[PDB]
Design a protein around this ligand. Sequence first.
Ligand SMILES: [Zn+2]
Ligand SMILES: [Zn+2]
Ligand SMILES: [Zn+2]
Ligand SMILES: [Zn+2]
Length: 1140
Amino acid sequence: PKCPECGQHLDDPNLKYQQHPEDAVDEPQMLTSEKLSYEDSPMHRFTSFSVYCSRGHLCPVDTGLIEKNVELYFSGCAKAIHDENPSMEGGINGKNLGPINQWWLSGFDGGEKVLIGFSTAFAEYILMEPSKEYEPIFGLMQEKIYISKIVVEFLQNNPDAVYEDLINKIETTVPPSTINVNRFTEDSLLRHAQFVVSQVESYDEAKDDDETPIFLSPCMRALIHLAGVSLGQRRATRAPTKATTTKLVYQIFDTFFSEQIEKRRRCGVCEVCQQPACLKRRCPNLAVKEADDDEEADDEMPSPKKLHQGKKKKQNKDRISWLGQPMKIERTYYQKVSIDEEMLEVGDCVSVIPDDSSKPLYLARVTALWEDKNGQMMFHAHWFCAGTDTVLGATSDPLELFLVGECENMQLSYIHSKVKVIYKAPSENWAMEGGKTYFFQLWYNQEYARFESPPKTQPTEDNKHKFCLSCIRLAELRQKEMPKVLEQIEEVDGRVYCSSITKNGVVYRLGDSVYLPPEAFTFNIKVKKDPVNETLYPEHYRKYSLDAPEPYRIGRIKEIHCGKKKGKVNEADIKLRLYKFYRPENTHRSYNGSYHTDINMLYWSDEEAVVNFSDVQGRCTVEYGEDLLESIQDYSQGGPDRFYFLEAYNSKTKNFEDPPNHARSKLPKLRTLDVFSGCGGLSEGFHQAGISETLWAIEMWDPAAQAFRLNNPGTTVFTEDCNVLLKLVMAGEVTNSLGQRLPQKGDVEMLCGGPPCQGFSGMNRFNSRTYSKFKNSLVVSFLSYCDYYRPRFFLLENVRNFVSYRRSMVLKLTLRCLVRMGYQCTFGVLQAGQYGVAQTRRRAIILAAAPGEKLPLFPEPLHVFAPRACQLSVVVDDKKFVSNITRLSSGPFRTITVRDTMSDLPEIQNGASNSEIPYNGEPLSWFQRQLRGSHYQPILRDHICKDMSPLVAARMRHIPLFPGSDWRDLPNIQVRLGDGVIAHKLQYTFHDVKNGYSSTGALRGVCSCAEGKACDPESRQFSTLIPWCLPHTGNRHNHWAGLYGRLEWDGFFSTTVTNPEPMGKQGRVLHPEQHRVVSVRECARSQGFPDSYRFFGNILDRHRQVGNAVPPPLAKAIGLEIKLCLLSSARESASAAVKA
Ligand SMILES: [Zn+2]
Ligand SMILES: [Zn+2]
Ligand SMILES: [Zn+2]
Ligand SMILES: [Zn+2]
């Protein structure tokens, strides 16, 4: 019993038949009425409507029957186009009104004007209210339509919105009384995914701009993949931001566009492709792939080859003759001047023509001039680097050269011409200056991509002739790397026993402690599943289609025994006898040691080991706790590489005895402005490192600016657009609107900030479209703040991919900009997890130091972390750039786990709303002890989590506790959803040709596409415990591994969480044990925020605050590198005040 025209089942109890009114005259006759008074189709209103098949069954319109060619007829009261009355008053009745040509919509912009309309070969109709009988059908259609309105209006306002932003928008929208639904959930969006998506695509075709289609925003692409959407199904129709630049900054971006600015695998299958300068044949399937592809980068390639090592051509010899008297005599005889038709003097610059493999004319500075024992007239060439050959490439000034550590001896014959090379030195008031020939400003380090201030070491009279800065640089480096013996005692055999040695500029005496790889030495050693019920766990079959290393070994120096090279000591074969230290985990305690133990603590062991000095990783202080003048806490925080012991451990007895007797015995706070401050995470870390004071912050979002105020009372927190506050200082205004005191030149010592990269964040080459955005971006505004203020220190923090955006053009242009201003600058990727947080998050960091200060290094990882997460290198124009970081893999401390992070917090349930609750317990882990304080605090603030819908909540309760459990572990069971609502079972009705049958011979398919056919809609199940969408799109998305996943106690957070959603893109977000999502505080702990840190606004505002922040431990680490630059520069002036 099915309809041969509309398909509807006759046994369906919701089926209804059409009932005509009397008047009911057919379409043509109805249309010739005087009740009626810009298109060749009469437009009229239409109330009390009903849609039906030739057989008379009331029909939906949204179901695609019209498209499947099925003739649909209608009836009701036709009224006048201006008549707003939804009653059958001023109107004629019509019946079986001509087969519906197509249906349409309008009002996707202005007011709540969403009008539904029908089109017939006779006329156009603007549907008013439906008939009694047809009302429920038009009712479901009304829902579908409202959701589509919310989505479209939200996307016009908020493009760039992420999946979690949409879910919140939908969940939060209060539908009018007229809609039969109380509120829309994620379950609704998934149910009407095909409708919504096809409507969002329709809006794009309809109103036309040069702007990005709305179906391509992140939330929309996330929906398309998660739900099983078929793109391309067509339907219905109906001044730019200016950056406050400085002259300098403007010209860089201006003089880049005005140069570099130049100018397809379509699916075929879709309805868009299957249609014919008219063009709107833009394949949605290709568009999605392209947009998804543009979001991915390339993370290994060899060390870049050193320049100037190619062949050179010789110039013809006319007259080459020395002028003046020899400067010195060494087998070699130096001279101040030489003749080569014209005059060349020690210190001039020359051009050397190479074997033109690209034709780039080589440039050098004439270091020395001499005549070798064979009468060959030589010169030493200290090579220059063309800007187009530094990281900068094409963006650089073509007249700009750079100093390098590249120099070689050559015959005077290679010289083609003497070249004028000017040093563009900084002014006396370079700091107050904010707004032809070859020149150079900086010294470039190819490997690490550091532009720094020229050495400024002047020639001694002993080497006034031979003076090469590259030779001096190489010298220092070779002698620092060198393993040399400082003081030697007495030899036994052919091995000399010493009291002190050195390497990497670190001095190692006897009794000092050392770091070593875990493979250096050893300690004293130690010594199958059953079938699943597949009817109950039908998705578990999907469960099957390198971890963190060990921290350093530690030992105290007993002997420095050595070897002998014929005459003296064999500097290479320095050996070390050491006393082994155990970490509580190394001990029989193992994993049970590592919990409550101070990350700092060790145990003494009379055990001995011999290793090479070449394996020593560094020095560290291991002291006895009872022979300490301060408390362990005071000691441990006092400085880096500080470890302690209070007991000793006998491996044989497995006992802890007291240790033996032989085991015993101002900083300038830079005045900071933090643009795009947030709640102050970066300001916090920098405050902890002691290097700063944040007196000014700029944050446009009220809840964040409020939260920054709470935590920094001394700060002037501006909430105006930074572009306005800049135009205001560049006008002499001393105060803003509220009368807040504007910072001026000299006030700001350090400038930091995280500029958003809104409309250009993508990997492909620039366009007219993408450049436009970047040209006036906050990156441009931020660089301008740097140019006007001329701060001593600068930091631009961002997502790691900032380094790869637009073929690295965002990075290259940022560096070029810093260079034109005259700054020492560099870049690097850092992994948050390596500095003490239970989270994998990389960040691009752009450091800059003013001429006069020194350019800081990137900090050495303090924590051992998984290698997969620590991919720190950057490819720029197919050359591999690396930072000064040496600790590739290892480090002094064990990883910080989710357990360390939150194992102390008291239980909370889903929807937990009390912001101020007792702790109900003491801290457990070392980490917890740190963020809580070494005292008593009563209140636990922000241990608050989202009230998830009864459906989500029920799923969370059914996720098991075993580490690694996600949605694949859910049971296929009916659950009473708190209210009247009942979460039903997922029906397996299709074959999965690729996945086979279950162990019970059951089907695994959930949609017709599992069999290779097209999707059959309304095979689409909703309000199921196992979400229908997941088996639907599983095979193409790695079985959505992690979705509804609980964090592992031993694990970490996947990324910075800003809004936890179980089917989102922010990773495993459920609590390891409790039937809820991670709390605001749990996230704050993942970010290494002290427990006393304050947040502001509603729950979501507090989640976004926490998640948007730079983790304070990463900022402390960076801050401490600034510490060394300050200390080092403060003592350099002091050891020069004496010489003056
Ligand atoms: Zn029918
Ligand atoms: Zn297509
Ligand atoms: Zn040299
Ligand atoms: Zn399907």
